[PDB]
Design an enzyme around this catalytic site. Sequence first.
Site, PDB file in Angstrom:
ATOM      1  CE  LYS C 163      50.922  34.220  50.430  1.00 49.16           C
ATOM      2  NZ  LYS C 163      51.184  34.201  51.889  1.00 49.16           N
ATOM      3  CD  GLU C 189      57.381  28.806  44.352  1.00 51.27           C
ATOM      4  OE1 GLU C 189      56.375  28.451  44.996  1.00 51.27           O
ATOM      5  OE2 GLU C 189      58.032  28.027  43.627  1.00 51.27           O
ATOM      6  NE  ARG C 190      58.642  29.373  52.110  1.00 53.08           N
ATOM      7  CZ  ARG C 190      57.767  30.196  52.667  1.00 53.08           C
ATOM      8  NH1 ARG C 190      58.122  31.398  53.088  1.00 53.08           N
ATOM      9  NH2 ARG C 190      56.501  29.809  52.794  1.00 53.08           N
TER      10      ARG C 190
END
Lengths: 425, 473, 468, 469
Positions: C163, C189-190
């Site tokens: 993704k 997200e990261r």
Amino acid sequence: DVGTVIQVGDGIARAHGLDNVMSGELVEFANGVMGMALNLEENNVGIVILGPYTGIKEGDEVRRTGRIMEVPVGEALIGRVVNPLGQPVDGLGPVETTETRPIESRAPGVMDRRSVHEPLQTGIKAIDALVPIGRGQRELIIGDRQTGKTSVAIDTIINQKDQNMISIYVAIGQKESTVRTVVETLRKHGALDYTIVVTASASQPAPLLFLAPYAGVAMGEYFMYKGKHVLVVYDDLSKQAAAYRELSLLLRRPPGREAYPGDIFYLHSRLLERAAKLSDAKGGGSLTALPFVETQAGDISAYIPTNVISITDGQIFLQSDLFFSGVRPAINAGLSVSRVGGAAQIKAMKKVAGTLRLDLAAYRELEATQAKLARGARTVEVLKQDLHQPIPVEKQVLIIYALEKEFYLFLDQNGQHLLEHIRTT
Amino acid sequence: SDVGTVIQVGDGIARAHGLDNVMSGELVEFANGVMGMALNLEENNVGIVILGPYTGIKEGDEVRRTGRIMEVPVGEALIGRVVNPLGQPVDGLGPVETTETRPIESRAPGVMDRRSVHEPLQTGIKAIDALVPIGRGQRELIIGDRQTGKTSVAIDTIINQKDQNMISIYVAIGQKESTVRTVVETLRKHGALDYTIVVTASASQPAPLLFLAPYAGVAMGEYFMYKGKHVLVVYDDLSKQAAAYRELSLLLRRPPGREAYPGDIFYLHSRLLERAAKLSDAKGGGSLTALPFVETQAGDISAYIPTNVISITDGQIFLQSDLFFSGVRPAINAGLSVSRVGGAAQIKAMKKVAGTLRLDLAAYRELEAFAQFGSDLDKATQAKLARGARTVEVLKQDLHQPIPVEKQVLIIYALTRGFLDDIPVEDVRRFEKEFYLFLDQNGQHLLEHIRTTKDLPNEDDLNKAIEAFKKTF
Amino acid sequence: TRGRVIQVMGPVVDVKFENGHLPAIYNALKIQHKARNENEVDIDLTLEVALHLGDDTVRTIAMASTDGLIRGMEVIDTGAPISVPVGEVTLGRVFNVLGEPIDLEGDIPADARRDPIHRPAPKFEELATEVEILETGIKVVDLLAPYIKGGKIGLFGGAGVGKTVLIQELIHNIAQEHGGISVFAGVGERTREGNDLYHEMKDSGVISKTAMVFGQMNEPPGARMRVALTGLTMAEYFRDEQGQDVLLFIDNIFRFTQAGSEVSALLGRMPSAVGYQPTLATEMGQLQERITSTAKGSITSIQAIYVPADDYTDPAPATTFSHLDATTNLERKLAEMGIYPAVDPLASTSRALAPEIVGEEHYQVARKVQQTLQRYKELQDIIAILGMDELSDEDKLVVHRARRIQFFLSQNFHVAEQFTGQPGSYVPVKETVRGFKEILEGKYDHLPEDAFRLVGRIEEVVEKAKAM
Amino acid sequence: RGRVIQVMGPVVDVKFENGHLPAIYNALKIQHKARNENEVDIDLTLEVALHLGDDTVRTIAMASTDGLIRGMEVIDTGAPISVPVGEVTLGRVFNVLGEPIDLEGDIPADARRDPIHRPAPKFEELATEVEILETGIKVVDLLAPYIKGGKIGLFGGAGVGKTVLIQELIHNIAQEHGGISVFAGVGERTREGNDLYHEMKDSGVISKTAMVFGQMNEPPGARMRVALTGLTMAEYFRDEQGQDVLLFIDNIFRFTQAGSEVSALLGRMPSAVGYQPTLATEMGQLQERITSTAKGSITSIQAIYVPADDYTDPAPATTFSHLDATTNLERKLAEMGIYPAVDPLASTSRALAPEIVGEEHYQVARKVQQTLQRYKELQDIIAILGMDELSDEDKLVVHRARRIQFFLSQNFHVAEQFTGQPGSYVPVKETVRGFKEILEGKYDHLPEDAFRLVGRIEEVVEKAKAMGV
Ligand SMILES: Nc1ncnc2c1ncn2[C@@H]1O[C@H](COP(=O)(O)OP(=O)(O)NP(=O)(O)O)[C@@H](O)[C@H]1O
Ligand SMILES: Nc1ncnc2c1ncn2[C@@H]1O[C@H](COP(=O)(O)OP(=O)(O)NP(=O)(O)O)[C@@H](O)[C@H]1O
Ligand SMILES: Nc1ncnc2c1ncn2[C@@H]1O[C@H](COP(=O)(O)OP(=O)(O)NP(=O)(O)O)[C@@H](O)[C@H]1O
Ligand SMILES: Nc1ncnc2c1ncn2[C@@H]1O[C@H](COP(=O)(O)OP(=O)(O)O)[C@@H](O)[C@H]1O
Ligand SMILES: [Mg+2]
Ligand SMILES: [Mg+2]
Ligand SMILES: [Mg+2]
């Protein structure tokens, strides 16, 4: 600022009268057992016990420490074995420290980090050549029972000896005998000269198993924010997830997909996001992380494995085909992928072995082009590995480039004229 | 006792004190003018479901009972418009000028007020028109996976009703507003807006509007049903209505059921669908035909809402993803599809050929599993397989391409009689195209006979026309 | 009108306003307390009112860590929802949830225009519906499920399927060369991904026309819930008050639903199916309906949707599937086979795949490719049981061309450099259609299937074949 | 008099005097005239489901609850739902409450009304006297005969033919055995209810049948008590009239789902697939009152919908424990034109033994079963290999098996509505004679289409003559 316990269950209590208690504080029970205040309600305060709760009874007074969830840290922890609360558990006396770090400290922001620029030489051929790990990565080790995951962690910590990096071992739910064996193995290899060990065995209450990796992360944070480099290993994050599920269900929280709570992602996230490679302005420190996950029947598409994969920067899938199939540690390179990639390796390794993973994935697909299959089987056999001995990268890069113990001895016994050039560059 | 104070506001619902004389299902008004429905009545607490933006409602705000069940305005003005469940227009075309209202919750016509459904609702889709016949007054479910052709089938149905006096209502529920707008514009392009009403309940709308949308649509349809007109109501997903009602019930603290769905969810669908009926000549010939939609996740028709809606309806058209991706369009599973009206909702000419077509498909479904050995099979098995392949090519249709009933009958007659067993399979579609033009060139008498008498023409003349075309091909 | 904290939980806090002046729902609240002695901790926290309760009480969702909160603490009411600073100042800057910059570029001026993050979606007469093909350069995406300029696109994937890499290539291929404006909102997200993407955006000279919002996995549920709304507000000002084309990227919109589910039980709502919120669909719709094109301006929105436990029938992805024009489904099985972007060639479909939108040739070749791949998937069981030799000649040709197509649907990525050491490729839609039409015709039957993996145009396949 | 205190959909809570509470299953009436223009007239009937204490009962509605106001009085009738029984009941259509929903007048007040809740007949009041009930359907009379007093279940999918088979059983039994028939429209489709009423009225069975319809668009309580209403009518006819009485039930599945929905509304924890915990108890309480006693007998024919072909679903599996005979209706046969689409091999009867039907009947039925099983086994070989590969005995067995397979299908008296062809009635003796003649090879020279849809084997010969053989 003292209260009276009104309920005490399976390691979770409810007290009355703690008016000024901060959320996440530390509280002292009458017999000296630490606890953490989780929920504050209109009339009562929910406490989670962090030790033997059988000595705590209703009516026992509870005092307020005035401090948030913290763990002691310093240089004295090096070589010591402590519980998640920092109290020593080996027979080597107390640990004399001066500084404390909060358990749930905020992770560094998005501007405080930098791209992974340097390698973390684990010392295993496939891990250091096929699934590289950097000094700020969060690389997940995932596999079934056996499959040599703890072995990988021990070899990593052992090989970090010549490196100028502190190491930490966090044991979640593991057998205390196995933790003792691992500690003595690190002692016999000198790894305790720089390694801290945090232990929370199976007999321990669920809150301690839930809390241990946070203590390990904070202990590493003390060294990383000081500019040093750290490596933290959680011996099983699946067991921490199970402990948190138990602790939540005891609190009458409705479960989720596999009886786990809704926080079971966040619980790991705020952990593995504290492992980062800080920028040059922030001192340049770093904290590598090696979470462990155990899969039932090798199914990786489960709930906790996918959570941790979503959180980490890659994974190493150690499939069960080790002790009835050989070639241990076998690598499912079609699934073991490092998301940092060639930035972690040295220039020579990136040059020589940048194509192994795709070749292995294609070969595993085609075993569902005779030259391709022959070369793929050769790529499978070359990465065969030995026992707990680290192997240096400098003599292994050319061994990889050949496509070999005879090569290993031939390269070095004929002189270091090839060794020093790559030891310098 | 006619005025209370709201004591809890949250997440699209409210709880009030002191609405002593409120009726179940009544309407209440808040200080900011937002409507609400008093659903749960309790000992010292009234559960109100919020029919608007609830951000402006705060605890302690006044609430006043209106003493009026929800009524949807309805009339001949609504035709060609796009409205919400409350009947207010959503396009910029100005207000709808109706002058009468119908209660949103109304009784379905009784047992003796109906008549056996006998006149066909011509879908224009050959597979449906032949193997899953639909008649005016039926309740037919279309059930399938996501992106298989449900909305396309309904839109083609509405398109085909140009010259059939067959008034249509399209209840768009749960769809994003862009999808509803695209549906409206593609109905307009083909000219359906001249006889179509569109009810819009998008995702951002409060969940009770989603819950009430099919009620409003069927209430609008009943007005034309009671005047002798024929009405078609299409709900683009009853699954999302069920989800919204479950959300309301869970917020209102009602005990869960099979899948947290409310205990009365079945009731909620049934009393809706059974409002689609064909009336007897005493009440007028006006009828209402329903087309509920259901989406299955892993092709799992074994869930709660799919099972309920399958139980209610008089037939189910199963759309399959594996059929959609295999080139079978519009991907109708004629083997698993059912119609309890059957031949009662077909032209006699269509019946005489659809029976043989059903026999052919039943025979063909008995030899699909043997096609793995199809290179070296039996002669009779090979003939049946070839006829099945020709049949599945014949039943293939394109998007927004309705076919008149007479030409469907003629192509099915050509297929069943064995005139297509010589041409190659991949050419069948081309055949089905060119032959049609051939008819409009020469076979006008046959089409006129079918359209007038509603029965198959003389068979030797039909065979002669087929032979002439085969010479032409 | 000061309030008092009565209950404290992890992500939720209960407040009491005894003066009979309660805040509205979504009103912002402030805890701003200084430690009066050694036994407290100074706290600066933002709360968002979620529910009202009896006896002058409000349930709110805190936007940061609640540790250190003490019952009886003072509460300030801002009188308005969370207002984020919007306009020209947002361009070239990075903000947290509350719109406060975190990029060490200075404090946004106080008198800047601020907009609330909670507003109703555009009404029916306002949206503009029109399908124009957006060229991404990705073979499978532009062939089997073309994206719509101004539409909504969803990249559905499990854990570690591609993704984020796909998002990066869409930014590198589309946002760089487009003269509109861009917004990136990192929802759950990261933080490493956010920092790396920020650096890739700056060194490419695109940050000059981009705003960023970052609330990541390390942040409490409220932050992950409202990051998407803050980014949507930032893009919506550009769409409405400027009328410029907007590219809105959301690297995980699923985390908004997940964070809403985390606080669902604590708010006081009974569990729905699979433990999700009872109001999953309504809460998601109140957000996804604001992400839309209007007669004022278009918004091309690309959202990556995480699929828990690799189950597409999960309530959150299933509910999200009805909010998107184009959909890309990322499969773990394809990823394990080395086929990247691991796009499912069948389950991924877009509204733009019509003969009148992409042409007759494109529609014909895409449908033929999909039919061939479905036929191969169905033939796989017969091949497993009976074998390969028992297949007919037509089925053998189908399997041949299906393997060729499935390999050729993969292509080397630009962002794959660090993962492959190979430069990326950009394939025009004409080249993709021509290549697949030639593959189906049999022009490239003799080429070994290995040459079709991680390749650009069709001539690159024969160039790779010369290497064998 | 009580008063309604809580309304939550089809569930109503009523508070009474301190000591004068009604019993469980008692019927309560809410008849309220609109005092003002802001309210509506209410005519509703509730059944006391359980007791909450504090002088409060929880009750289930048998009509629409919309328009109820807390505090309006509730009439305690002191007895469960009462239903008109007997001569007045015949030739009429009632709802769950016994009110006639037809336009042919109504029922006088001064008539005998039986409660619908009553304990099942005792152990020593029972009577086990096995006797075959002749229905006139060849496949049923041969491969799965019915017994008087038995419970015969017709399991099937969505369009197999359960309702048309119930219609034939009603028509054939009324026209030949002259028996009283009761019809219970459990979760009845108003369209199918109208069709059933019209086809009863047209063929004259209206005077031998009494229809009870619990409409599909009614609250679950009505749909799960309408079966008990029909059973009460049938039990009166059995006891006070003596001669055999039949009770047809629309769908048992819809009664179990109505019970499940009622339990979910009441708040009880679900069991198995969401079903009510007391599912077995409720099904027993229904099916245990359908028994043959010393006074008379009640035969029952019940259609069961099997969802997704899942026979392990709680409703069909629980029904299986009460059925003497089970007939499986298969869609595969129906698509082939075989009607009533009865599965020959999955149809089981308690009375397919020589001691009940005779040695000849049992032998013929077993031979037919064996031949059909052998044909089913040979299906794959005849599909792949040619018929030449089969031996002479295999050729003969398939040759006869197709003839039997079509011969089990018979023209339906009600199918004249669908296909126009007049139906037929086949005595059991002639049925076994025809199947024996088929198995003897007397008609291996007749083409199979002659056996397609006929009543007697003599009709097979006549049809073969008709085609020009
Ligand atoms: N390369 C190797 N060659 C031979 N034995 C090995 C190798 N790697 C690991 N082992 C052995 O494999 C066993 C399991 O190792 P270990 O690392 O503890 O697996 P594990 O992940 O800890 N499984 P568990 O005990 O549930 O935690 C030990 O006895 C090791 O000595
Ligand atoms: N008969 C057909 N022939 C060819 N393509 C078709 C046909 N019917 C539908 N399609 C295509 O399939 C797409 C799916 O449209 P649609 O009919 O809305 O599916 P759906 O069942 O409504 N899935 P969804 O709307 O997401 O619930 C359409 O946009 C067309 O591109
Ligand atoms: N074109 C490509 N070539 C090679 N590798 C690729 C390609 N596309 C994706 N990958 C790999 O896909 C892996 C998954 O990375 P990523 O894109 O972050 O997955 P993800 O969906 O973002 N995981 P998450 O966001 O946490 O749900 C990376 O390790 C890449 O190396
Ligand atoms: N004996 C028969 N002859 C001809 N057609 C029949 C026969 N039985 C059923 N059918 C057809 O099949 C359909 C079955 O409907 P029905 O029997 O009501 O379904 P169910 O068995 O599920 O109640 C009917 O609408 C009719 O068209
Ligand atoms: Mg649709
Ligand atoms: Mg990612
Ligand atoms: Mg039926």
